Amino acid sequence: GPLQSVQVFGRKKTATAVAHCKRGNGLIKVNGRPLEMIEPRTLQYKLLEPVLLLGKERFAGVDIRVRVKGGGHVAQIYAIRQSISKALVAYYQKYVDEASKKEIKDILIQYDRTLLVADPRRCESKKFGGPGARARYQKSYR
Amino acid sequence: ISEASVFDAYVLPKLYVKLHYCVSCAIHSKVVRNRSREARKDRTPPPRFR
Amino acid sequence: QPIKLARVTKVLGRTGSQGQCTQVRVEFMDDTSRSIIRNVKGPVREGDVLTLLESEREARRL
Amino acid sequence: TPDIKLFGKWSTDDVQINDISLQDYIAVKEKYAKYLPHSAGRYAAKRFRKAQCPIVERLTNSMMMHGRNNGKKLMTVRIVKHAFEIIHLLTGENPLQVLVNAIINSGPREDSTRIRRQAVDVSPLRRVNQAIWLLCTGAREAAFRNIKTIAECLADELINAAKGSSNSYAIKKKDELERVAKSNR
Amino acid sequence: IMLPWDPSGKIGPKKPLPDHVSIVEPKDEILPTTPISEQKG
Amino acid sequence: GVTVKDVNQQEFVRALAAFLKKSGKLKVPEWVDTVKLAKHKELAPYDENWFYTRAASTARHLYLRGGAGVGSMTKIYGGRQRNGVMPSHFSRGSKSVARRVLQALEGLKMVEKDQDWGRKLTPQGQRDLDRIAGQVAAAKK
Amino acid sequence: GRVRTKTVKKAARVIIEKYYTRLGNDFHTNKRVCEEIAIIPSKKLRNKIAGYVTHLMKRIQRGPVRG
RNA sequence: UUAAUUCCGAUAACGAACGAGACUCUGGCAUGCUAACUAGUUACGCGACCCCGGUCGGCGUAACUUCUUAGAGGGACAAGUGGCGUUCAGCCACCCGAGAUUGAGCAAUAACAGGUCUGUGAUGCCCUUAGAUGUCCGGGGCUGCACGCGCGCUACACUGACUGGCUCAGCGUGUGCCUACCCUACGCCGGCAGGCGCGGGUAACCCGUUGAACCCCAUUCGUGAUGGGGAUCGGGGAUUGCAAUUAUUCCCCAUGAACGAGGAAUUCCCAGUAAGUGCGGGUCAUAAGCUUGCGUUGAUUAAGUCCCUGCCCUUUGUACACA
Ligand SMILES: [Zn+2]
């Protein structure tokens, strides 16, 4: 059918990602690769937490292309986790009916807010006269 | 004493010592205190509430 | 000498010089009539259970 | 599947908590059922926001101390993941039930302080935090100039705490502090 | 030397003080007690 | 089919190093045994055939991001320059060993020189990369 | 320590005493009325004045105000 | 009552301002407006490869602001519910909501026998005034050493030591005024050090799309003042300025001590906080163990008080008097 293009950004930190949705078969890719060669292998289930709760039926028609820039590694993991979640919410919001979108949203509200809403946590600037922001130097007596 | 005793419900005595202090010794024991000039004329004691 | 239980129904204030001993009115969950006042350290809210080794101890007025 | 959540290979079920006091503060049941305990933060805003943090994430975060271990969360999650494998092969029962029983046993209730010494009780959240700090301190003290690893030392400390034969560091310090508090009262 | 405020902006600045609030004068009017039509055009 | 991005890069470099050991015509000198990699590194590499691993890494880096010279090769070969009691910094890799890797891969018929520097990968070598990706996929499956 | 200031208290009572008719319990109603009748330089001061006006309206709906 | 003389209230007090509050820059979000060939996105077609379809920071041109950049405005206010309190000022918990406390600057009156003549062609007085306390060259000294402290850096390891593989940032900076002094890209010579000619830029173009450290994965080690530590020392090879030894600086080999988690005493701080670990700017013929910003990972405890060290008012004898 027509090109159902949904471009949603995911921003939590310096690592940003843009998720692009489409109709067709189900193949989720992040710049042309799946989620199976992720280093470290400890956080393999962290990106599967939105996958296992919804099931294989919801990801049949949805294929997502993700471009990633900046930040670190785990910041990129949280960025793509927020971006594909908000893009999936927008995909079920705009085209298909609102009842199925509400049924999917009722799962995502109860579990975690990080999937939907980001928090304003950034690096505070270093102040003068100390090794960091809060800490100061040692005072020289005598 | 109420845990370990021979008698049951033994009444306790009290202390009765009439203390006396002078002008220097009362302030050294920190009992009296300098008040305002309108409050110096009051011969009333501080109120006994507890 | 049984090991008893209690329950915090209402906090009263903060005793001590540094302000670490919380004056807590504790309600006995075994006997729901009697209640005493004790000083309990740490963050104490209304609803938790405190396991008393003996219930004969009681904190005095500050 | 959303019906069951396997923490590695361990479900939410078969977790029985005997103490009703510690169950109100430990909030790992029915809300924080996760696959990995990794998170970003913000669990120290309210006075009682610290109890809403899960005890697996607390065991993860309390290991990294003393300068050189800062920034090794990816290390210590895999260390605890191997520690579950070390516990389950020797015990046979549920390591989550072993850890819940260890938290039930290792609770220092009364403790004296200098204000004479006033021997008073502490909070149950303070007992949980003291038990976690004593087990992490005992593991860090045991795993020093030794071939035995962090997961092996933490598994041995949890098995000794579940046994309760004055062998674990948390059990030993709990009995010592209760002995001192029983003495000076 | 401090410059005073002016509406024209010649002896001083044009922007008023943040603490000062210029409240206008309210209009005086009488409420109508009888419905009256007014037709024109 | 499969691709080298779908192939995990941990075993892909080992499989390509095994393929280059099966080839065995890539100009290995005798000062590789006595050379140190860079000044920030301390000692020699452990494995004796550590030219072919660098050749496999240079092959996949020129496949993914073509048009690279000496600095892009010295950037990936870096670490902590532990001088001693002084605070450590970052140091670049050596130039001549990467130049000899580029000369060996240019002598082998898998690349082609590009304008304004760089060695792009030929369509004949793209077929070989797809076939070895299929070989790694058949090995893992 | 969100205490309404004297620059708010001198203005809001005069505003309500003059335009007592054109008021409302809703915040967005009198927030735009204060934009018409008064000249407030900043949004934070505007919102503090409008919140104190709504608080005075709640005081009126509860009972009589002495001031 | 609060960070506040911030407000209710008591009223011989009423009416004002200064400091704070208030005000500016930055951050959290507005798929609603305008814009982008020195920022892009989605596709069309060509080329390469695998077996009807996928891959390409390989190329040419059709739509758009979903990413970036930034002119204009918004929202957030204790507004809604439940409790405490004169039911006043206000305070606390909760639903919904990008946020129910981002940081900084400006900072009232009054004073120090506080510092600065060694920043000043800002300056009073004294001295020098030709064999000059002025100006210039070659060295020395500013580093020096029985002793005591101040500010900093790295280790005392198995959580670690060695070797590769794998994967990310934003501050910046830069073709000359006398004046030579700028960033480096790419193909080579060599183990490194360093060297030869060569193209781009007056900068969202060039370095650069900043493959930075930690990190994760795969090999070697195993309780030994040890493979950790390089304090100590010798030989050779190069760059910088006219000129380096008491080592300007860099590279290779060899030498392998103190140090087994630290006594009395003491400093800093309370959420992207301490901490681990890097990178730019200034100092720069040669120039980071200094200082400031920019990043990545990321904890324990606490939501109270004047017991301890200070500062700020009070009642009052006044051995405290251009004080
Ligand atoms: Zn006397």
Question: How would you describe this structure to a colleague?
Answer:
The structure is cut from a larger assembly and holds seven protein chains of seven kinds. Chain A has 142 residues and is α+β, with helices and mostly antiparallel strands. Chain A has three helices and four strands, in the order E-E-E-H-E-H-H. Chain A has a single domain, classed as 2-Layer Sandwich (Ribosomal Protein S5, domain 2), CATH 3.30.230.10. Chain A has a four-stranded mixed β-sheet with strand order 1-2-4-3. In chain A, strand 3, helix 1 and strand 4 form a beta-alpha-beta unit. Chain C is built from no helices and four strands. Chain C has one domain: OB fold (Dihydrolipoamide Acetyltransferase, E2P), CATH 2.40.50. Chain C is globular. Chain C has a four-stranded antiparallel β-sheet, with no helix packed on it. Chain C is mainly β. Chain E is elongated, with a radius of gyration of 21 Å. By secondary structure, chain G is mainly alpha-helical. Chain G is 66% helix and 3% strand. Chain G is built from three helices and one strand. Chains in contact: A-D, A-F, C-D, E-G. Chains C and D meet through strand 3 and strand 4 of C and helix 1, strand 1, strand 2 and helix 5 of D. Zinc ion binds next to loops of chain B. The structure holds one RNA strand of 323 nucleotides. Chain F: Its main location: cytoplasm. Chain F: Pfam families: Ribosomal_S19e. Chain F: Keywords: Acetylation, Cytoplasm, Host-virus interaction, Methylation, Nucleus, Ribonucleoprotein, Ribosomal protein. Chain F: It is found in: Cytoplasm; Nucleus, Nucleolus. Chain F: One of its GO terms (cellular component) is cytosolic small ribosomal subunit.
